[PDB]
Short mmCIF file of C-alpha atoms and ligand atoms in Angstrom, two decimals:
data_model
loop_
_atom_site.label_atom_id
_atom_site.label_comp_id
_atom_site.label_asym_id
_atom_site.label_seq_id
_atom_site.Cartn_x
_atom_site.Cartn_y
_atom_site.Cartn_z
CA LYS K 1 0.00 0.00 0.00
CA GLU K 2 2.51 2.57 1.32
CA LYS K 3 5.30 2.38 -1.36
CA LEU K 4 8.34 2.06 0.90
CA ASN K 5 8.23 -0.67 3.58
CA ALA K 6 9.26 0.18 7.21
CA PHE K 7 12.45 -1.59 8.28
CA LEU K 8 11.17 -1.83 11.83
CA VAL K 9 8.09 -1.21 13.97
CA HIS K 10 8.09 -0.46 17.66
CA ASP K 11 4.73 -0.03 19.40
CA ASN K 12 3.10 3.03 17.67
CA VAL K 13 6.34 4.07 15.89
CA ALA K 14 7.32 2.90 12.43
CA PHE K 15 10.93 3.37 11.09
CA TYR K 16 11.96 4.05 7.45
CA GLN K 17 15.24 4.48 5.58
CA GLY K 18 15.83 6.90 2.78
CA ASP K 19 16.88 10.29 1.60
CA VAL K 20 14.30 13.12 1.35
CA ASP K 21 12.92 12.27 -2.12
CA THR K 22 12.63 8.59 -1.14
CA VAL K 23 10.71 9.25 2.08
CA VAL K 24 8.54 12.10 0.73
CA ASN K 25 7.53 9.86 -2.20
CA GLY K 26 7.42 6.56 -0.40
CA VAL K 27 5.91 7.17 3.04
CA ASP K 28 2.32 8.01 3.94
CA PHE K 29 2.30 11.05 6.39
CA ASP K 30 0.44 14.39 6.90
CA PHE K 31 3.55 16.49 7.47
CA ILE K 32 7.33 16.03 7.41
CA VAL K 33 9.57 17.45 10.14
CA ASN K 34 12.70 19.43 9.28
CA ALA K 35 15.51 19.36 11.84
CA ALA K 36 16.04 23.14 11.65
CA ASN K 37 18.24 25.66 13.42
CA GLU K 38 16.91 28.83 15.08
CA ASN K 39 17.69 30.91 11.91
CA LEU K 40 15.72 28.58 9.54
CA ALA K 41 18.90 28.79 7.46
CA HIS K 42 18.92 25.44 5.77
CA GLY K 43 22.61 24.88 5.07
CA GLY K 44 23.17 21.24 5.69
CA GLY K 45 21.78 17.82 6.23
CA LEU K 46 18.15 17.17 6.06
CA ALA K 47 17.36 20.92 6.00
CA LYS K 48 19.35 21.50 2.73
CA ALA K 49 17.87 18.34 1.18
CA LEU K 50 14.33 19.47 2.01
CA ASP K 51 15.13 22.92 0.55
CA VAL K 52 16.52 21.36 -2.67
CA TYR K 53 13.35 19.20 -2.85
CA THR K 54 11.13 22.28 -2.80
CA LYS K 55 13.41 24.01 -5.22
CA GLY K 56 14.10 26.83 -2.75
CA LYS K 57 10.53 27.54 -1.74
CA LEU K 58 11.30 26.37 1.83
CA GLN K 59 14.24 28.77 2.30
CA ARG K 60 12.30 31.59 0.69
CA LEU K 61 9.34 31.06 3.08
CA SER K 62 11.72 30.58 6.02
CA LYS K 63 13.28 34.03 5.30
CA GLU K 64 9.90 35.48 5.19
CA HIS K 65 9.12 34.02 8.57
CA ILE K 66 12.48 34.75 10.14
CA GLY K 67 11.45 37.64 9.48
CA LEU K 68 8.06 38.63 10.69
CA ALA K 69 7.83 38.34 14.42
CA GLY K 70 10.62 37.23 14.68
CA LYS K 71 12.94 34.21 14.71
CA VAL K 72 12.63 30.86 16.38
CA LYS K 73 12.89 29.36 19.87
CA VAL K 74 14.40 25.92 20.40
CA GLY K 75 11.52 24.37 19.58
CA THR K 76 9.01 25.27 18.66
CA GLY K 77 8.10 24.47 15.15
CA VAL K 78 7.04 26.50 12.13
CA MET K 79 4.78 24.84 9.55
CA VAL K 80 5.16 25.81 5.91
CA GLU K 81 3.42 24.39 2.87
CA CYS K 82 5.53 23.85 -0.21
CA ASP K 83 2.93 22.77 -2.65
CA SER K 84 1.63 19.35 -1.63
CA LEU K 85 4.32 19.11 1.09
CA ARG K 86 3.82 20.34 4.63
CA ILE K 87 7.16 20.88 6.36
CA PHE K 88 7.20 21.34 10.16
CA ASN K 89 10.40 23.21 10.85
CA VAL K 90 11.35 22.23 14.40
CA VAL K 91 14.39 23.65 16.18
CA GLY K 92 16.08 20.73 17.84
CA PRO K 93 18.78 21.44 20.44
CA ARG K 94 22.53 21.51 19.98
CA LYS K 95 24.35 18.97 22.15
CA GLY K 96 24.75 20.50 25.64
CA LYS K 97 23.70 20.46 29.30
CA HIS K 98 19.96 21.01 28.63
CA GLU K 99 19.78 18.72 25.58
CA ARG K 100 17.33 16.28 27.17
CA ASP K 101 14.93 18.97 28.44
CA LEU K 102 14.96 20.57 24.97
CA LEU K 103 14.51 17.30 23.01
CA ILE K 104 11.47 16.77 25.26
CA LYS K 105 10.02 20.17 24.25
CA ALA K 106 10.71 19.59 20.53
CA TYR K 107 9.22 16.11 20.37
CA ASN K 108 6.21 17.36 22.29
CA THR K 109 5.67 20.12 19.70
CA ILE K 110 5.89 17.45 17.03
CA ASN K 111 3.58 14.97 18.81
CA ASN K 112 1.00 17.68 19.40
CA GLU K 113 0.85 18.93 15.76
CA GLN K 114 -2.27 17.49 14.09
CA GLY K 115 -1.64 14.55 11.76
CA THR K 116 0.73 11.62 11.37
CA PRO K 117 4.25 13.05 11.47
CA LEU K 118 7.16 11.75 9.52
CA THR K 119 10.12 12.95 11.66
CA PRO K 120 13.91 12.50 11.76
CA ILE K 121 15.63 11.67 15.00
CA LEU K 122 16.32 15.30 15.98
CA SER K 123 19.79 16.61 16.67
CA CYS K 124 21.58 13.36 15.82
CA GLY K 125 23.42 14.65 12.79
CA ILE K 126 25.24 17.96 12.70
CA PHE K 127 23.95 18.82 16.17
CA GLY K 128 25.89 15.84 17.57
CA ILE K 129 23.43 14.42 20.14
CA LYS K 130 23.71 10.60 20.46
CA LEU K 131 21.14 8.99 18.15
CA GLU K 132 19.96 6.61 20.90
CA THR K 133 19.43 9.47 23.39
CA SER K 134 17.32 11.52 21.02
CA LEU K 135 15.37 8.33 20.01
CA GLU K 136 14.74 7.47 23.67
CA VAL K 137 13.11 10.90 24.20
CA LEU K 138 11.17 10.47 20.90
CA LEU K 139 9.62 7.17 22.09
CA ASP K 140 8.87 8.52 25.62
CA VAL K 141 7.02 11.56 24.30
CA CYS K 142 5.33 10.10 21.25
CA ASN K 143 3.41 7.47 23.18
CA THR K 144 -0.05 7.53 21.65
CA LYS K 145 -0.89 8.25 18.02
CA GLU K 146 1.01 6.64 15.15
CA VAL K 147 4.34 8.37 14.34
CA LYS K 148 6.77 7.59 11.57
CA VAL K 149 10.50 8.10 11.88
CA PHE K 150 13.11 8.20 9.17
CA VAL K 151 16.85 7.71 9.16
CA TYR K 152 19.33 8.11 6.31
CA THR K 153 22.48 5.97 6.56
CA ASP K 154 22.89 2.20 7.09
CA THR K 155 24.79 3.13 10.26
CA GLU K 156 21.70 4.90 11.69
CA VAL K 157 19.58 1.90 10.66
CA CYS K 158 21.73 -0.45 12.75
CA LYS K 159 21.66 2.00 15.61
CA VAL K 160 17.84 2.07 15.61
CA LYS K 161 17.52 -1.75 15.41
CA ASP K 162 19.98 -2.22 18.22
CA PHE K 163 18.41 0.36 20.56
CA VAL K 164 14.93 -1.07 19.92
CA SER K 165 16.34 -4.55 20.53
CA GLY K 166 17.39 -3.36 24.02
CA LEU K 167 13.73 -2.59 24.72
N1 LIG O 201 19.87 13.90 2.30
C1 LIG O 201 19.22 13.45 3.40
N2 LIG O 201 18.01 12.83 3.32
C2 LIG O 201 17.37 12.38 4.43
N3 LIG O 201 17.85 12.52 5.69
C3 LIG O 201 19.04 13.16 5.92
C4 LIG O 201 19.81 13.66 4.75
N4 LIG O 201 20.93 14.25 5.22
C5 LIG O 201 20.93 14.13 6.55
N5 LIG O 201 19.82 13.47 6.98
C6 LIG O 201 19.68 13.29 8.45
O1 LIG O 201 18.48 13.74 9.08
C7 LIG O 201 18.67 13.38 10.46
C8 LIG O 201 19.08 14.59 11.32
O2 LIG O 201 20.35 15.13 10.88
P1 LIG O 201 20.69 16.69 10.58
O3 LIG O 201 20.00 17.17 9.31
O4 LIG O 201 22.19 16.85 10.57
O5 LIG O 201 20.00 17.54 11.78
P2 LIG O 201 20.48 17.94 13.28
O6 LIG O 201 21.48 16.94 13.75
O7 LIG O 201 19.17 18.24 14.00
O8 LIG O 201 21.24 19.31 13.03
C9 LIG O 201 20.48 20.43 12.51
C10 LIG O 201 21.37 21.38 11.72
O9 LIG O 201 21.78 20.78 10.48
C11 LIG O 201 21.15 21.46 9.37
O10 LIG O 201 22.20 22.13 8.66
C12 LIG O 201 20.13 22.44 9.97
O11 LIG O 201 20.01 23.64 9.19
C13 LIG O 201 20.64 22.68 11.39
O12 LIG O 201 21.65 23.71 11.44
C14 LIG O 201 19.68 12.23 10.48
O13 LIG O 201 19.01 11.03 10.84
C15 LIG O 201 20.05 11.94 9.04
O14 LIG O 201 21.42 11.48 8.92
#
C-alpha cells in the first residue's frame, strides 16, 4: 500500500530508511519534520535536502518568517506548505547540558501537531546528540498516536535496530 516498507516497527512508531525524495515519495504522512536551526537557514543535512526538494521555496518562506515576528525558539516548530508538502520546521537542540529537556520540548511540539508526522531523529546529525538518546526521548514523548520516523544511513539503521532490541 505505502510504497516504501518500514524496516522496523516499535509499538506506535514505524521506522523508514531513505533520503528526502525517497521518504517524501514513499511514506504516507500528513507532514514532514525538518531538523532546523533557530535561523531557519537550511545549510546542511536534512534541512538542505528538504530545501533542494522544494526548489528553494522552503528557504524563501523561512526568510519570510524569520522575518516577521521574529525568529525561532528551540523548539518550537514552524509549519510551511511547499505545494503538496507540509514541512514542520522544528528547532532541535545543539548537544549540551539542557539537551534532554529541549529534546522533550521539541518532540512534544511534534507529537502535538495534528496529523501523522514523519520525523527525523532530531539533533543526531550535525547537532551531535547521540542517536539513541534523542530516540529514547522520541519514544517517551510520542506514546499515543502513530508516528513515523526516518533515518538516512545504514549506520543509523543499525543503531535504531539495536536500541529497539534493548527494549
Ligand atoms: N539527504 C538526506 N536525506 C534524508 N535525511 C538526511 C539527509 N541528510 C541528513 N539526513 C539526516 O536527518 C537526520 C538529522 O540530521 P541533521 O540534518 O544533521 O540535523 P540535526 O542533527 O538536527 O542538526 C540540525 C542542523 O543541520 C542542518 O544544517 C540544519 O540547518 C541545522 O543547522 C539524520 O538522521 C540523518 O542522517
